[PDB]
Amino acid sequence: EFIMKTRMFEEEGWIRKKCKVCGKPFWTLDPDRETCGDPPCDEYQFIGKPGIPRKYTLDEMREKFLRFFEKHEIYPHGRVKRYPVLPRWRDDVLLVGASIMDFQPWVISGEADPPANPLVISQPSIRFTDIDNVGITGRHFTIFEMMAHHAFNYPGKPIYWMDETVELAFEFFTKELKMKPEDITFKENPWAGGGNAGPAFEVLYRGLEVATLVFMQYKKAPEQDQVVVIKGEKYIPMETKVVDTGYGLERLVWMSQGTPTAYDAVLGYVVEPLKKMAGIEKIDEKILMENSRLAGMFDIEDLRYLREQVAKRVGITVEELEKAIRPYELIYAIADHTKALTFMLADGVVPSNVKAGYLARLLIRKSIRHLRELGLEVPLSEIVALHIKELHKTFPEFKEMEDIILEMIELEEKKYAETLRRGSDLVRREIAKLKKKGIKEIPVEKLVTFYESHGLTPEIVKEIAEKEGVKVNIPDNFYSMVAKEAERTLVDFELLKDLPDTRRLYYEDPFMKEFDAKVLRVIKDWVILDATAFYPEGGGQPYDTGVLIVNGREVKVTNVQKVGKVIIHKVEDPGAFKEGMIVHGKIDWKRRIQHMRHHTGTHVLMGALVRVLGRHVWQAGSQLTTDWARLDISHYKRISEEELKEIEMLANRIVMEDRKVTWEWLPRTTAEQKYGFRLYQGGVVPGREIRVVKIEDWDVQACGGTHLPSTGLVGPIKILRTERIQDGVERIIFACGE
Numbered sequence: 105e106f107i108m109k110t111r112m113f114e115e116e117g118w119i120r121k122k123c124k125v126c127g128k129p130f131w132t133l134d135p136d137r138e139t140c141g142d143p144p145c146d147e148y149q150f151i152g153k154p155g156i157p158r159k160y161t162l163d164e165m166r167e168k169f170l171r172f173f174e175k176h177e178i179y180p181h182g183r184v185k186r187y188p189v190l191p192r193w194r195d196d197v198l199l200v201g202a203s204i205m206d207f208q209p210w211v212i213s214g215e216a217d218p219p220a221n222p223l224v225i226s227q228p229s230i231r232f233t234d235i236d237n238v239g240i241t242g243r244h245f246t247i248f249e250m251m252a253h254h255a256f257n258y259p260g261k262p263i264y265w266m267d268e269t270v271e272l273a274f275e276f277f278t279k280e281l282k283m284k285p286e287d288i289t290f291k292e293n294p295w296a297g298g299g300n301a302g303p304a305f306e307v308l309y310r311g312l313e314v315a316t317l318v319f320m321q322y323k324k325a326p327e328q329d330q331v332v333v334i335k336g337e338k339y340i341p342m343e344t345k346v347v348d349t350g351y352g353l354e355r356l357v358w359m360s361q362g363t364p365t366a367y368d369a370v371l372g373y374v375v376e377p378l379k380k381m382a383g384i385e386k387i388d389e390k391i392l393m394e395n396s397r398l399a400g401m402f403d404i405e406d407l408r409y410l411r412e413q414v415a416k417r418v419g420i421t422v423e424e425l426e427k428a429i430r431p432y433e434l435i436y437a438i439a440d441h442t443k444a445l446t447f448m449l450a451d452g453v454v455p456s457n458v459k460a461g462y463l464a465r466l467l468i469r470k471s472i473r474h475l476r477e478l479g480l481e482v483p484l485s486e487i488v489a490l491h492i493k494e495l496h497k498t499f500p501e502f503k504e505m506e507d508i509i510l511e512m513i514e515l516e517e518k519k520y521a522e523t524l525r526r527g528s529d530l531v532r533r534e535i536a537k538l539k540k541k542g543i544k545e546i547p548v549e550k551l552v553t554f555y556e557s558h559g560l561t562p563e564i565v566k567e568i569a570e571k572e573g574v575k576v577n578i579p580d581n582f583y584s585m586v587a588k589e590a591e592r593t594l595v596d597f598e599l600l601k602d603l604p605d606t607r608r609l610y611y612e613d614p615f616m617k618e619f620d621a622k623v624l625r626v627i628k629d630w631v632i633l634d635a636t637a638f639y640p641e642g643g644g645q646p647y648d649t650g651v652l653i654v655n656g657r658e659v660k661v662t663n664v665q666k667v668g669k670v671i672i673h674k675v676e677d678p679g680a681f682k683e684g685m686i687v688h689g690k691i692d693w694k695r696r697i698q699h700m701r702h703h704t705g706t707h708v709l710m711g712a713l714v715r716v717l718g719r720h721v722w723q724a725g726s727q728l729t730t731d732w733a734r735l736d737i738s739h740y741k742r743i744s745e746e747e748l749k750e751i752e753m754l755a756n757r758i759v760m761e762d763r764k765v766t767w768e769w770l771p772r773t774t775a776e777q778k779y780g781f782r783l784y785q786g787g788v789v790p791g792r793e794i795r796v797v798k799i800e801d802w803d804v805q806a807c808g809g810t811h812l813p814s815t816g817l818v819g820p821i822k823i824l825r826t827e828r829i830q831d832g833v834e835r836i837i838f839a840c841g842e
């Protein structure tokens with residue numbers, strides 16, 4: 105659908121062709137090349153014959169790339185510090201998949217200023233869409249570093265675009281890594297991801313896709329026909345034009361090494377130790393190389409038949425070959441998965457049964473199972489330390505979160521031991537139920553139930569079911585299909601867009617309890633005003649209540665809500681109010697002064713929690729009433745009664761200390777800079793500016809509720825009780841005041 109001519113192509117005499125195999129547009133400097141350069145159209149042609157002159161380490165290669173764009177003569181890029189793989193700034197993706205995801209949607213919407221323009225970043229990325237490929241294809245990981253130079257072109261203000269991009273890329277490959285310029289190809293394919301799309305180039309070299317360049321000018325939907333489908337979704341054009349690049353670091357370092365897998369090249373410090381521990385034998389070469397070569401020719405969306413095609417090829421039976429490579433697949437996955445695990449846990453992912461947590465856990469189960477398949481009994485946490493020992497030099501937080509990380513593994517590995525036992529029994533029982541029910545195989549669906557609810561991988565369900573004559577049928581793409589199952593998924597509308605924003609008098613003065621305002625509109629029994637001291641529901645804090653005095657009558661405000669920027673007021677007498685009218689409002693103050701205490705107190709508590717429990721602690725939920733308040737956090741073990749006391753004790757020391765509680769609007773990016781992602785506790789607030797409440801040297805938080813000037817005014821905090829809401833979420837209940 106899109107064009108794809110660049111200056112460079114036109115000037116240096118590239119030819120655009122349609123691949124003989126797949127018919128896709130691609131750009132080659134070589135008039136012979138008939139295929140796109142991408143498997144299965146091409147093979148791996150760099151194993152033992154590296155495609156980059158010298159040998160690079162992960163650390164050299166990263167620093168190379170980073171330096172190149174940072175110091176570039178023509179376009180200098182701003183260097184940006186990598187983001188947590190746990191997307192604290194948004195609510196739509198579970199983990200960080202591409203580097204661009206760091207910048208959706210706020211930066212790409214010009215709602216938030218980019219940290220640089222252009223910018224260069226090395227971004228840890230996690231993709232479970234390829235989890236079944238790890239250890240098989242030799243090129244996929246769960247966790248890899250996407251290196252990227254990004255450029256945000258807001259209207260009437262270019263940085264750079266398509267032409268300059270294919271160049272800075274092509275420069276780096278040839279003038280930095282010294283790649284053979286007529287082995288580079290540029291395949292055309294659009295790229296969609298995390299809310300945006302655009303046409304893109306797949307940079308292909310010697311049989312391995314090493315980079316991807318996206319020219320992003322699209323945003324999703326919403327539910328109205330200047331639309332374009334990019335990958336079976338709907339987009340409309342967008343104001344910004346963004347340069348989305350993605351450079352496979354691992355893939356490049358593999359290239360400068362020619363080892364049999366990218367894993368041997370990047371994850372040596374884990375793979376080779378593990379080979380000794382398994383006592384596995386250094387595989388036959390005429391077997392190893394004639395499998396290493398053909399490995400890139402098969403993905404899964406039927407691995408069986410590749411196995412027969414390398415069997416026939418090399419000269420042996422499938423089992424004979426299975427025997428040979430199988431241990432290597434397992435070692436690679438373990439090495440990989442456990443690195444994914446190190447990055448997630450350090451970024452405060454707490455294993456559980458939902459969202460990111462679910463994933464960490466999945467990863468842990470698959471790992472343990474592989475260790476058991478290799479007949480190894482080294483604890484998982486020991487593998488993980490190898491990753492910490494190695495990476496804590498470049499990633500300082502791995503050493504800082506090291507105890508929480510290791511400990512978290514321990515407990516999950518303990519818990520698995522038992523979950524297996526009772527699960528094995530529970531499944532066998534309800535399989536024996538099915539043999540007689542007349543079922544000889546076990547559907548995929550049921551196999552996914554057995555993981556979802558019992559915690560059993562199907563390498564376990566297949567044996568248990570065969571020691572009773574039902575069949576071992578594991579889909580190749582199982583684990584990725586399981587990873588999909590990690591997420592799920594009103595009062596007044598319409599007549600509101602035309603009305604102005606409601607002035608929020610509670611933000612100017614939280615102690616304001618009386619005010620006057622003009623009745624802007626009276627839909628149903630909801631009254632709209634221009635300005636209001638009534639705090640609408642949201643934040644964990646419930647609505648304010650009180651009276652609106654109108655023509656000398658008191659009318660009760662029973663509910664205050666907020667649609668968009670317009671706050672609605674449920675009254676008892678919709679008749680008594682007319683558009684135009686001037687009303688005197690009075691807040692039910694007691695109810696409010698109580699709420700503020702439970703609010704401020706929640707932040708004081710939040711501070712204490714982090715200080716005892718540690719850094720992984722993040723709001724999972726909040727509810728307060730005038731009486732008690734509750735704060736669900738994300739934690740792994742139970743909060744002991746000795747801790748519960750230390751938390752409460754520290755909290756009360758701060759209420760005693762009477763520290764300043766101060767709030768101020770800040771542009772999103774300055775805010776995230778000054779204070780880090782901690783600000784995004786409960787929720788992720790929209791808009792160009794955010795309200796930052798801070799308690800002096802204690803807590804800081806993008807929060808929109810009404811607070812108190814000073815902690816003294818909270819009064820003592822009695823922690824009533826802690827309790828476990830679900831895996832990874834514990835709950836602290838308490839009540840403040842006199």
Ligand SMILES: C[C@H](N)C(=O)NS(=O)(=O)OC[C@H]1O[C@@H](n2cnc3c(N)ncnc32)[C@H](O)[C@@H]1O
Pocket residue numbers: 201202203204231234243244245246247248250295297313314315316317318348349350351352353354355
């Ligand atoms: C830039 C665009 N947003 C993007 O992320 N495209 S991409 O999906 O193709 O990723 C860019 C590069 O990251 C690397 N990459 C993608 N998936 C990978 C995986 N599973 N393992 C290792 N590297 C991967 C590849 O080198 C790829 O060329």
Ligand SMILES: [Zn+2]
Pocket residue numbers: 123124125126127128139140141142145
């Ligand atoms: Zn092709």
Ligand SMILES: [Zn+2]
Pocket residue numbers: 643703706707805807808809
């Ligand atoms: Zn708050």
